[PDB]
Design a protein around this motif. Structure first.
Motif, PDB file in Angstrom:
ATOM      1  N   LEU A 193       0.823  -1.204   0.000  1.00 17.39           N
ATOM      2  CA  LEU A 193       0.000   0.000   0.000  1.00 17.39           C
ATOM      3  C   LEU A 193       0.859   1.257   0.000  1.00 17.39           C
ATOM      4  O   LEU A 193       0.542   2.231  -0.691  1.00 17.39           O
ATOM      5  N   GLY A 194       1.959   1.250   0.757  1.00 23.31           N
ATOM      6  CA  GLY A 194       2.847   2.402   0.759  1.00 23.31           C
ATOM      7  C   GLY A 194       3.475   2.651  -0.598  1.00 23.31           C
ATOM      8  O   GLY A 194       3.509   3.785  -1.084  1.00 23.31           O
ATOM      9  N   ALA A 231       0.780   3.932  -3.008  1.00 30.14           N
ATOM     10  CA  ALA A 231       0.438   5.326  -2.741  1.00 30.14           C
ATOM     11  C   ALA A 231       1.546   6.260  -3.208  1.00 30.14           C
ATOM     12  O   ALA A 231       1.272   7.334  -3.759  1.00 30.14           O
ATOM     13  N   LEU A 251      -3.784   7.156  -0.659  1.00 28.23           N
ATOM     14  CA  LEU A 251      -3.890   5.951   0.157  1.00 28.23           C
ATOM     15  C   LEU A 251      -5.258   5.298  -0.003  1.00 28.23           C
ATOM     16  O   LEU A 251      -5.367   4.066   0.002  1.00 28.23           O
ATOM     17  N   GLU A 265       4.319   8.981   2.205  1.00 27.29           N
ATOM     18  CA  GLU A 265       3.159   8.132   1.955  1.00 27.29           C
ATOM     19  C   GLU A 265       3.382   6.719   2.483  1.00 27.29           C
ATOM     20  O   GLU A 265       2.453   6.088   3.002  1.00 27.29           O
ATOM     21  N   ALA A 298       1.037   4.896   5.244  1.00 27.75           N
ATOM     22  CA  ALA A 298       0.397   3.605   5.009  1.00 27.75           C
ATOM     23  C   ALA A 298       0.797   2.588   6.073  1.00 27.75           C
ATOM     24  O   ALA A 298      -0.045   1.816   6.548  1.00 27.75           O
TER      25      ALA A 298
END
Ligand SMILES: [Mg+2]
Ligand SMILES: [Zn+2]
Ligand SMILES: [Zn+2]
Lengths: 76, 86, 166, 199, 122, 55, 512, 97, 39
Positions: free
Chosen positions: A16-17, A20, A40, D165, D169
């Protein structure tokens, strides 16, 4: 093929990081977001749709490795 | 109390003493001649193994004309251990 | 003109992921090695082909796609005896400034090896008579940065007769 | 206070705040209230893309005075920074290219850390969803008072905002409030009903 | 940044011409503004080298003709450098083979030059 | 001065615990951030005068 | 031994090349190591390692030994690598004591390391063919006579030869031939009845197989020590005493070894009988010379017995100590002056002495003698005993007396000489490489003349060589040449001091 | 800085680092303790393993093997202090792959 | 170790930094090579 078929929480966080970070860099959207300005949230939607173009390359401590797709892994 | 110096010492400080002039005579002349002759003659000997040239560009017709051919000495394998045979 | 095996790390930004990787890699390699000279190799022209392309990693930093690409690229490097055809783009009293056709102005033949009828009196006089051929002799390389070019080489002009041009 | 312990193992950071806490049952367990004064100071660098372009344009048009907005604009080509307090903000808003870094104010939906100075277990510092309120205290659901071991008797509380980011997350996934409802010591749940809720 | 082999495989001017034409058509079919503005030297070097090759007689060539010429010259014990130079120059005259070609001594034999001309003209 | 427009109207204004130089015309900063000594190190360091650091 | 390693590296790079000098430096630094770990640490190909090891063992620079599991360990000899700089001196002494035939013999033995008698006589004949002229030819008889004369004088010695493998466990051969040496045939020459005539290099079955020879550096070192002590006693008393001691050393050469505190007992009668007849000296004058040499404050010789008329003995260790003392005082005088040399000799004679006593006995005013003492102490030439009054060793309550340690001084002087020769070689190579362009220009403009010297030699190619741009640069070439000559002469001169210091160091070693 | 009156920020003590390690948030810890606290860019020469400036190695007097590298400023200060103590940390760089 | 990872400023091996990620880009491993004419 010998590791856990489920997708752990650390793998989820890292994927996910990375997604994003990519989307924040003007990456193409694969889920056709409807008014989602938060990258996100877009990564969460892509993970829910199981269309993230990222392959987890798990490394065994001895040196061997194995590739697992997002659609191949089981999410929770 | 020692005074403050505004400039570091030079890289080559001068000394009032100078090296003694070299010994002269037929002996030192023969020394120089023999040393130069040895330096010259020892490079073309097969013992002086130069670095093998690499990344050869191409092969040409005149290679055999310019091929560096020199007699190769065969070391006595009876006195040398077997771990050095090419 | 000769092929060289080059292994390079290419970083493709994520906003180019829609493009094909085998095309973006070639584009980036051509943009990175255009009109440049590799040390002890020569002036590289462009990418010829891509032999090996391994997995595309993504680092925890920038996040772009990093690929270690093995490829073959063309470079210009004579074999100390090749004959070339250059045009005279100037001349100096100590040596003629002949430049290869639209390729590079790096060939400076010294005027000290032909028959004793060589003299350049600054009036663009090539050679005192009794599409110019050029015989490379030795390559030479050097660095550029020395504080917080590099390929010229010498040229031989033997008694080639030159029945078409003196 | 040496190099190893005072400068390598633990060091001070920026983009952080320290404020007094107060109970608020009207907020979710994974949400936390942030005062407008601290929200106007703590900024997050967002990169301009094809999706959030209009939102960032509106934020720039608002300026550093209205709460929803930004404070600085960083261009893509050049690394210059433009303060939004001076100059026609409409011009910079209409000249927002893709990839520009805009330091937007802390708004709703941003994952933000929340930590107490005495950290005993890992649940002492958790990531929540930031929300803005006109008051001046950090407000959150009291069901998370048991991990923080707080009692609302004047104890100060820290709040850290990631600037990446990936960090955001990781905070939302690993340090999510809904994902850390139980302690790893014995599996007993910690975030549950408390006084004035049990009775 | 490392170099594996600077002289792995020698190639003539026809392969370079084909590669230049392929890169030119690929660029004209996939032209980009920012990619061009990043490094304009690419188009310049490609166009100039293509024009230089076009000025040479390198036109009207095909890989089959090159292979036939190579197989024909392999029977005259000539080295790779000489046949490469003959292919790059394409000498239509005998003087360029008798004089311009290096190491002409003991190789002309006053009879193979006609065969070389007949092969280079085809 | 301004690097783009050349305006020399740069003003020092106290931000939210931050010191920087910015032009009042285009709002562009030229130098941000300032380095100041900490009192933790100030009490440790010993003062030296030019009456003693010259001999 | 960083200076020694650097000097060995420079010498190997100058004499044998680059791929072998790396292996040599690795062997010197890491000691004995098998071939596999050598190739692993060096990071080069195995064939180059094998070639380097073979070319090193050819010149007797390295050796190999066997250990457990039959593994072979190769160890280099840093002393042997250092001794090869003294080759011109060896050639000069073998050309002085013998004819040019022995000169060429020793030259070939040094340039090849291990060779057979037939090979060396053939090479000597081939090299001497161009030396002489008039169509005549030489034979192998005189060359063999010179070889056997070098052999009996112990200048050349047979290399260690592998024993008979047929008699020594006939079967599976070990990885190493286990070369051994026998003192019986150490200087014996097998009969070679074959003769021949050398060819003039027109460019248009081994009876002595298995027998290899090499120059015995021990004999050269002993002869150089004898020449040094002869020159010393000549500069001391007279040339007659030098001739007497030269005769006694010539007599003692055979009956004594290379390392002994004293020589064998020699009586005055046999010395007089063996004395050359060119001197009209009687027995009484010889006895007076011997008894005055025995009373010398240097103690070069000693009585050590009264039987057989005049019995006398020489002191090798004392003579080497006196030579080292002379070298040290000379270098001190040349580095700091005559007054500092006087202070050094004063502090050397007296075992311990104080600053005020130094000033009194040396007769030097204050503020200068102490400065010389400090300058000499900062260069590791003296040592302070520092006898303490208290175990605290506080400087305010302890004495300080200067003392010269000749051993450490000689060691540091030898290190300084090694680093000096290394710096000289580095400067020579730098001057050679910085002018390599002018060198190549000179080589080409002189090879234009070297070609067509006789065949097709037209005179039109003689007035254009000096016309080139190298003519104003000939002065730079002459300066480079004279600088290289001076550097080589300085290195060869420092080589004698190195030999003296090494002899003084080794003579006091017991190897126990 | 430390004090609030000195415009000081919060301190991530040892226990906070311990909690972040226990959570396994590598990137969050990297952003907090390196990027947002004492991030700096230095120059290291791959030949000698020393620190350079402006892409230049004063030790080797060259700039071919010099490369930029991100680092906490406290680590650079520690390296400089150790070099002052004649304890030279030789940094051998390598590719990220 | 994690200590030096924190000190040197690199992602620690524990946590999410144990494995690596690969981008699913449209490509072709070992692309077709242009044939050599002269050689
Ligand atoms: Mg409390
Ligand atoms: Zn402006
Ligand atoms: Zn360096």
């Amino acid at each position: 093929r010998i590791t856990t078929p489920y997708m752990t929480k650390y793998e989820r966080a890292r994927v996910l990081g990375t997604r994003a970070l990519q989307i924040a860099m003007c990456a193409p959207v694969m889920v056709e977001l409807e008014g989602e300005t938060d990258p996100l949230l877009i990564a969460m939607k892509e993970l829910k749709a199981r269309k993230i173009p990222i392959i987890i390359r798990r490394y065994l401590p001895d040196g061997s490795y194995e590739d697992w797709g997002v659609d191949e892994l089981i999410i929770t | 109390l020692p005074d403050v110096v505004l400039k570091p010492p030079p890289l080559f400080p001068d000394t009032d003493y100078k090296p003694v002039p070299l010994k002269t005579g037929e002996g030192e002349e023969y020394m120089l001649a023999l040393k130069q002759e040895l330096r010259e003659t020892m490079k073309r000997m097969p013992y002086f193994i130069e670095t093998p040239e690499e990344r050869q560009d191409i092969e040409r017709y005149s290679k055999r004309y310019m091929k560096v051919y020199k007699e190769e000495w065969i070391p006595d394998w009876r006195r040398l251990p077997r771990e050095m045979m090419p | 003109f000769v092929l060289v095996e080059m292994v390079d790390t290419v970083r493709i930004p994520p906003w180019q992921f829609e493009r094909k990787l085998n095309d973006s890699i070639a584009e980036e390699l051509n943009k990175k090695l255009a009109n440049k000279v590799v040390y002890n190799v020569g002036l590289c022209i462009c990418l010829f082909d891509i032999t090996k392309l391994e997995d595309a990693y993504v680092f925890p930093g920038d996040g772009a796609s990093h690929t270690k690409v093995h490829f073959r690229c063309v470079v210009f490097h004579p074999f100390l005896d090749e004959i070339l055809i250059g045009k005279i783009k100037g001349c100096s009293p100590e040596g003629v400034h002949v430049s290869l056709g639209f390729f590079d102005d790096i060939l400076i033949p010294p005027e000290s090896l032909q028959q004793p009828a060589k003299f350049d009196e600054a009036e663009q006089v090539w050679v005192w008579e009794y599409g110019e051929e050029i015989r490379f002799r030795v390559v030479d390389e050097s660095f550029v940065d020395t504080s917080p070019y590099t390929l010229v080489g010498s040229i031989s002009e033997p008694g080639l007769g030159l029945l078409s041009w003196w | 206070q040496g190099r190893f312990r005072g400068n390598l193992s633990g060091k001070r950071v920026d983009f952080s705040g320290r404020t007094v806490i107060s109970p608020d049952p009207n907020l979710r367990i994974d949400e936390v209230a942030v005062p407008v004064h601290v929200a106007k100071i703590l900024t997050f660098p967002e990169k301009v893309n094809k999706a959030n372009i209009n939102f960032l344009r509106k934020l720039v048009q608002n300026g550093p005075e209205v709460h929803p907005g930004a404070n600085f604009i960083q261009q893509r080509h050049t690394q210059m920074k433009r303060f939004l307090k001076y100059g026609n903000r409409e011009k910079m808003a209409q000249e927002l290219k893709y990839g520009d870094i805009v330091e937007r104010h802390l708004i709703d939906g941003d994952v933000v850390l929340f930590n107490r100075q005495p950290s005993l277990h890992k649940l002492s510092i958790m990531a929540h969803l930031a929300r803005v309120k006109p008051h001046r205290t950090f407000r959150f659901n009291e069901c998370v008072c048991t991990p923080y071991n707080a009692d609302f008797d004047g104890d100060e509380m820290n709040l850290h905002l990631p600037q990446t980011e990936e960090a955001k997350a990781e905070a939302l996934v690993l340090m999510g409030t809904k994902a850390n409802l139980v302690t790893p010591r014995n599996g007993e749940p910690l975030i549950a009903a408390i006084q004035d809720f049990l009775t | 940044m490392e170099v594996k082999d600077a002289n792995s495989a020698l190639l003539s001017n026809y392969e370079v011409f084909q590669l230049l034409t392929d890169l030119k058509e690929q660029r004209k079919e996939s032209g980009k503004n920012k990619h061009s503005s990043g490094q304009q030297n690419l188009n310049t070097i490609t166009y100039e080298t293509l024009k230089y090759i076009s000025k040479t007689p390198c036109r009207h060539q095909s890989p089959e003709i090159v292979r036939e010429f190579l197989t024909a010259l392999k029977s005259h014990k000539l080295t790779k450098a000489e046949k490469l130079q003959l292919l790059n120059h394409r000498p239509v005259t005998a003087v360029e083979i008798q004089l311009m070609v290096e190491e002409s001594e003991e190789r002309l034999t006053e009879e193979q030059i006609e065969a070389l001309l007949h092969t280079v003209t085809s | 001065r301004c690097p783009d427009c050349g305006s020399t109207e740069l003003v020092e204004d106290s931000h939210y615990s931050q010191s920087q130089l910015v032009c009042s015309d285009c709002g562009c900063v030229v130098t941000e951030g300032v380095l100041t000594t900490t009192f933790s190190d100030e009490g440790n360091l010993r003062e030296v005068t030019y009456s003693r650091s010259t001999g | 031994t960083q200076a020694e390693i650097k000097l060995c590296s420079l010498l190997l790079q100058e004499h044998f090349g680059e791929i072998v000098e790396k292996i040599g430096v690795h062997l010197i630094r890491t000691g004995s190591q098998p071939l596999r770990v050598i190739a692993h640490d060096t990071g080069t190909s195995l064939d180059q390692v094998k070639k380097a090891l073979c070319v090193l063992v050819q010149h007797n620079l390295v050796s190999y030994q066997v250990h457990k599991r039959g593994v072979v360990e190769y160890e280099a000899q840093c002393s042997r690598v250092l001794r090869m700089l003294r080759y011109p001196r060896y050639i000069y002494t073998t050309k002085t004591l013998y004819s040019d035939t022995g000169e060429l013999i020793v030259e070939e033995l040094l340039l090849n390391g291990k060779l057979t008698m037939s090979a060396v006589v053939k090479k000597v004949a081939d090299r001497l063919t161009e030396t002489m002229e008039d169509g005549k030819t030489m034979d192998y008889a005189e060359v063999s006579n010179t070889f056997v004369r070098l052999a009996d004088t112990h200048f050349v010695q047979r290399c260690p030869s592998v024993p008979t493998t047929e008699n020594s466990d006939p079967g599976p051969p070990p990885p190493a031939p286990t070369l051994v040496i026998n003192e019986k045939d150490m200087y014996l020459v097998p009969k070679l009845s074959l003769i021949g005539k050398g060819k003039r290099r027109r460019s248009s079955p081994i009876p002595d197989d298995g027998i290899y020879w090499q120059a015995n550096l021990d004999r050269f070192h002993q002869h150089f020590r004898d020449q040094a002590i002869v020159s010393a006693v000549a500069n001391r008393m007279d040339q007659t005493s030098s001739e007497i001691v030269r005769t006694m050393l010539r007599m003692s050469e055979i009956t004594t070894s290379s390392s002994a505190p004293f020589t064998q007992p020699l009586s005055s009668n046999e010395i007089f009988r063996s004395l050359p007849v060119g001197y009209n000296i009687s027995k009484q004058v010889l006895d007076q010379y011997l008894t005055l040499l025995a009373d010398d404050p240097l103690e070069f010789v000693g009585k050590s017995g009264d039987s057989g008329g005049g019995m006398y003995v020489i002191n090798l260790h004392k003579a080497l100590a006196s030579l080292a003392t002379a070298t040290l005082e000379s270098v001190v005088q040349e580095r700091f002056g005559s007054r500092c040399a006087r202070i050094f000799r004063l502090v050397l004679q007296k075992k311990h002495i104080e600053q005020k006593q130094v000033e009194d006995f040396a007769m030097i005013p204050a503020k200068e003698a102490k400065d010389m003492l400090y300058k000499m102490l900062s260069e590791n030439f003296m040592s302070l005993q520092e006898i303490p009054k208290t175990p605290d060793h506080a400087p305010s309550r302890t004495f300080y007396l200067y003392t010269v340690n000749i051993l450490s001084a000689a060691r540091m002087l030898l290190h300084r000489c090694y680093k000096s020769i290394a710096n000289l070689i580095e400067r020579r190579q730098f001057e050679t490489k910085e002018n390599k362009r002018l060198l190549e220009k000179s080589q080409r403009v002189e090879a234009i003349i070297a070609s067509m010297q006789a065949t097709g030699a037209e005179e039109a190619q003689l007035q254009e060589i000096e016309e080139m741009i190298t003519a104003p640069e000939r002065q730079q070439l002459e300066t480079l040449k004279r600088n290289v000559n001076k550097l080589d002469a300085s290195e060869i001169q420092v080589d004698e001091t190195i030999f003296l210091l090494e002899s003084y160091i080794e003579c006091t070693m017991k190897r126990q | 800085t430390e004090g609030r009156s000195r415009d000081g920020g919060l301190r991530l003590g040892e226990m906070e680092r311990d909690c972040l390690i226990g959570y396994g948030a590598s990137m969050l810890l990297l952003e907090r303790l390196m990027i947002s606290s004492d991030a700096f860019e230095v120059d290291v020469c791959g030949q000698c393993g020393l620190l350079g400036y402006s892409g230049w190695c004063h030790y080797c007097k060259s700039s071919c093997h010099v490369s930029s590298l991100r680092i906490p400023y406290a680590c650079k200060l520690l390296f400089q202090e150790l070099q002052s103590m004649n304890i030279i940390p030789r940094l051998k760089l390598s590719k990220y792959n | 170790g994690v200590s030096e990872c924190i000190i040197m400023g690199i992602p620690m091996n524990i946590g999410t930094g144990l494995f690596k990620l690969l981008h699913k880009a449209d490509r072709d491993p070992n692309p077709p090579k242009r044939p050599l004419i002269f050689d």
